[PDB]
Subunit: 404 residues, 3 copies
């Protein structure tokens, strides 16, 4: 029952200790409180009545913003995003290119506006300051952890960019982990528009900040000594839309290619598998069979561990967007396999992160531009940082499955 | 009657004098003839029979070019831009993304071709030379004023780019105003494809050249002494299409975000307004209530000044494309408020310009690349140049409403 | 009969000799074997039974990859690329923007993956090595010729980029010709998705390598002495998709503008032609009337030479994509003119190449970045290289028409 989840949390923490750069340098106050906060945050908003109300209230607010933003895409694509599409094409009336991708553009503009007004910096300063006074983590890495709750792995460190070039290896590693353990507000609204429960997305986003610091300081403890704009609001929104546009185009092209490549791989795996008596062999079978123990470890029932492994594995070997795209049909009435409500939550939390190998190249470019003489350190800690981000997503999923 | 319009022209001229850098340095020949030309041009093509025929002939030619260009977008999007769309989705069959945006790509290619052939430079040389010999304005600033009739605020100064780095503050300011007082051929065809009368777009475009110089020399008189390519036609069209593509994407992303943001703002203004007994409070109400006196000043009837204020205000606080998008439904039979034919003309002329705050950032980049050591002067005169461009659009609207 | 084709091959070879930089420097072994290989390759896969089976087997494999890739675009655009589109919009249900353009993105990703795995370099090394040992051509120019079978004129020389800055004028010219005589894998799949027979596309692609070297060494014989990466497979696919996206957007914008411009030109040619009693005058008539002798020379029947001239001429004065777009309707049952199966093949082969004037500007940029001090030589040999690429496409078409 609940004993299997507590063992899951132990195993995840155990792997991080085994992969630590210095186990004897691990600060118990830091990693103790970091786990305590992520666990309590999960308890607060998933179990305790008052916390569940604050979570649904924030989620409904996010759901209202998305609909407001949908007026913009409704103007551009007219009846191609109306209800008539379902009357004509049925299930195929939901055009992803026009339904989900424009949301990335709107939310990028909105966040850019909330930065200009000082609203974002105000919230980050409070959350980031609460983390450092309770974990003993440095000023810059704590703000980046808080910033990552709302924005991407490359946009988050911008709040502390003059401190990035001279921050310690442990600090840089935590900044990398904070980004890999989290997503961004734009894609969050995208996944929400695909049927993923907003309550799970917001919850996983907030639990990412302490969870990112947790496995960052476990696998890479501090062994050194740390230290310590658009002309108007309309230009801010315009720049945000432009950034969101570029992101929308890149994500869309990636989904065409990656899903397309998977179909090719399944075609080849059908012929190759046939040589060994398994003509029905596909990529989903391999990933499911290989990630089932991991899925079972974090609280997924034995008879649903294989299916849950397909989604978790796909997120790791590719990215979470491709995973969410294959998992989204399982959140409707036309789902090929009816999953338990707890299993749906676990998959949602475990997927909610940028933790993949391809995000290292993005970290080399974005975070590397902020500190060109540190690109060597970024490339070196890349794989370890992905693992740390992965463990954070898995821990948040285990915690979520526990209180559910 | 016609006395209210003449007072409107006086007020607009009065504001420019009050905001002048040196009222005693204002050349009466310059600003006298500049107003005389813009007024006579309005009289010529809106009142006098022969002029009305030349205007409708040019407009029909423009209307034919758009339809020719529509073969290109018809090929790409097929039945999504056919008549069947109206039979299925009704009013929502008109897909803006495919109906209006591709036109920016085609017209950008066409203008780029007309530049290679020397046709554009031929027309600009004649118009620009007629302005300088009648106003005493310098060679470079006069050609830029003429060029702005057809192309954008960043593309226009390219005809005099080696003279830009060393031109006077008054010259640079006029170049900025010429761009803010006008639009570009590409978006012109876009607005025309949205239902805006081509006769009003072409008229406002041509009246922009003397109107731009008018308020430029009023608010910033000359106090110094002025001075004085693609391999083939197929490469020209290709480069133009590429430029138009980038423009199409940026405009589209902006419309998704801005309209989306407005819907969010109206949602918040509904809740905020409710605290003061006004739950129906929206952005359109604020802009209408605040710009109604201005609209009434330029010839809009008292019972239509509020609605006309919504569109004019929106163009100022954002951009003219967003304004035109909200005004376009009022040009159909399904209009929520039936406006007089004169009011429709006034709104069309007053909107027809790039005069907004966000265009300053664009002027810093485009016009700034032509003279990197002058970006300081551009940022300094930015706001004054927007005001001057705004007054030009308002003057052209007052003149248009007078002869109508 | 077959005597007219052999004369066609003679004429094409004759023109190249007349335009040679040094006829006395022409290596007979080189150009003899180069023609012998291109002719035998045509004989092998178009006439001989075993070769026809290898060609249809490779083509069916390519056809399967396209369908696999179509899962990606099906996900993005849903019912807009389903069969329901034909039930509602009829013929206009086939939306080019969603049916053809996404294929460029998928195939770019795939090729980028096959490069990372070493599969591409393996095939190129074998083909390129077979060409040099039989023609005496240098190492670098032979690999580039082989690489061009699969990728574009700018991507092909990347396999020998450190040898490009110091290769001879004859070597650089051949590298240019190898790209102009061929297309790329991405657009190949596009043309295939437009109804062009894959067997003809693959055949023309492979015959491009010896055909490119043939007319390169004919028009520019060697008179000097020659000499002699993404972190993971997922980053490779992502970079390929990004590149393919940029290509998709540029091609799409070009088709909107160029087709749009043609409609404008036909409108003007109707009015201009009317002055000389020919109001029905169009661009297709001019190109057909002017390229009919050329079409008749390469094996097109007298009563089909005019129509075939329209497509061949359009490919030359613009690009092969615009030509294929106008030729594609003639490959369906709703064709305005029913052409013989041999004529359809000849048009397909003669169009299958990047040989146009606009590709010179692309060669200046892409190939020029690999050797910035050689941009002068590229601009100088530009026109000659286009002619050489044109003659290669025409030769392959003559050979194809001969064995058919
Ligand atoms: C859509 C619905 C909501 C409506 C919102 C409309 C209100 C926006 C007002 C703009 O704010 C000002 O704009 C200036 C221009 O962008 C800025 O000046 C700055 O930039 C100018 C030009 O670059 C300079 O002249 C100034 O000195 C410099 O302070 C200035 O900082 C900024 O406060
Ligand atoms: C679609 C319907 C209408 C059909 C129109 C077709 C006609 C176009 C003809 C192209 O014109 C020439 O093209 C050359 C190549 O672009 C240019 O040469 C220039 O560029 C070459 C290569 O860059 C050099 O070799 C030359 O010396 C240099 O003068 C040259 O200036 C230009 O006049
Ligand atoms: C979608 C279905 C198919 C599933 C396929 C999944 C398998 C992919 C495995 C990735 O391969 C490795 O990834 C590393 C990271 O990209 C590379 O390390 C390189 O890059 C790292 C970070 O940049 C460094 O830490 C390493 O030392 C450096 O060798 C490494 O070369 C590469 O072999
Ligand atoms: N805003 C950002 O920084 C961002 N957004 C998306 N992605 C990348 O795109 C993938 C799919 O969302 C993720 O795994 C990230 O690596 N990065
Ligand atoms: N061609 C150009 O230079 C151009 N086109 C459009 N815009 C900008 O986009 C806004 C909407 O058209 C305008 O106010 C301009 O600031 N600039
Ligand atoms: N991959 C490439 O290098 C490429 N692809 C397309 N084109 C250019 O675009 C035109 C239409 O396909 C061709 O003639 C080329 O000049 N180049
Ligand atoms: Na983040
Ligand atoms: Na202009
Ligand atoms: Na090629």
């Amino acid at each position: 029952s609940l004993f299997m989840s507590c063992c899951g949390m132990a195993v995840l923490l155990g792997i991080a200790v085994l992969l630590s750069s210095n186990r004897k340098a691990i600060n118990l106050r830091t990693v103790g409180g970091a786990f305590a906060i992520q666990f309590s945050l999960g308890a607060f908003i998933l179990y305790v009545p008052w916390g569940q109300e604050l979570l649904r209230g924030f989620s409904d607010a996010v759901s209202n913003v998305i609909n407001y933003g949908n007026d913009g895409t409704s103007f551009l694509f007219g009846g191609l995003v109306s209800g008539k599409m379902f009357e004509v094409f049925g299930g195929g009336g939901f055009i992803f290119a026009f339904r989900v991708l424009p949301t990335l553009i709107f939310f990028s503009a909105l966040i850019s506006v909330l930065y200009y007004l000082g609203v974002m910096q105000w919230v980050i300063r409070i959350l980031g300051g609460g983390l450092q006074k309770a974990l003993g983590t440095s000023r810059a890495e704590s703000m980046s952890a808080a910033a990552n709750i709302f924005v991407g792995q490359t946009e988050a460190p911008l709040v502390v960019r003059p401190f990035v070039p001279k921050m310690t290896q442990s600090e840089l590693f935590a900044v990398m982990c904070g980004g890999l353990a989290s997503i961004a507000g734009g894609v969050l609204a995208g996944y929400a528009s695909m049927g993923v429960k907003i309550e799970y997305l917001v919850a996983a986003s907030f639990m990412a900040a302490p969870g990112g610091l947790l496995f960052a300081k476990l696998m890479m403890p501090e062994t050194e000594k740390p230290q310590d704009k658009p002309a108007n609001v309309i230009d801010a929104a315009a720049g945000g839309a432009s950034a969101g546009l570029q992101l929308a185009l890149n994500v869309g092209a990636m989904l065409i290619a990656f899903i397309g490549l998977i179909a090719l791989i399944n075609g080849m795996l059908g012929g190759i598998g046939g040589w060994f008596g398994m003509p029905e062999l596909k990529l989903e079978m391999l990933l499911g069979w290989l990630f089932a123990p991991l899925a079972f470890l974090i609280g997924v029932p034995w008879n649903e561990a294989t299916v849950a492994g397909e989604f978790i594995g796909l997120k790791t070997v590719a990215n979470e967007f491709v995973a969410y795209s294959q998992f989204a049909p399982y959140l409707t009435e036309a789902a090929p396999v009816v999953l338990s409500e707890k299993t749906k939550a676990i998959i949602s939390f475990a997927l909610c992160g940028f933790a993949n190998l391809s995000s290292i190249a993005i970290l080399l470019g974005g975070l590397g531009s902020l500190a060109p003489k540190r690109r060597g350190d970024i490339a070196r800690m890349g794989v370890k940082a992905v693992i740390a981000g992965t463990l954070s997503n898995l821990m948040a999923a285990t915690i979520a499955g526990f209180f559910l």
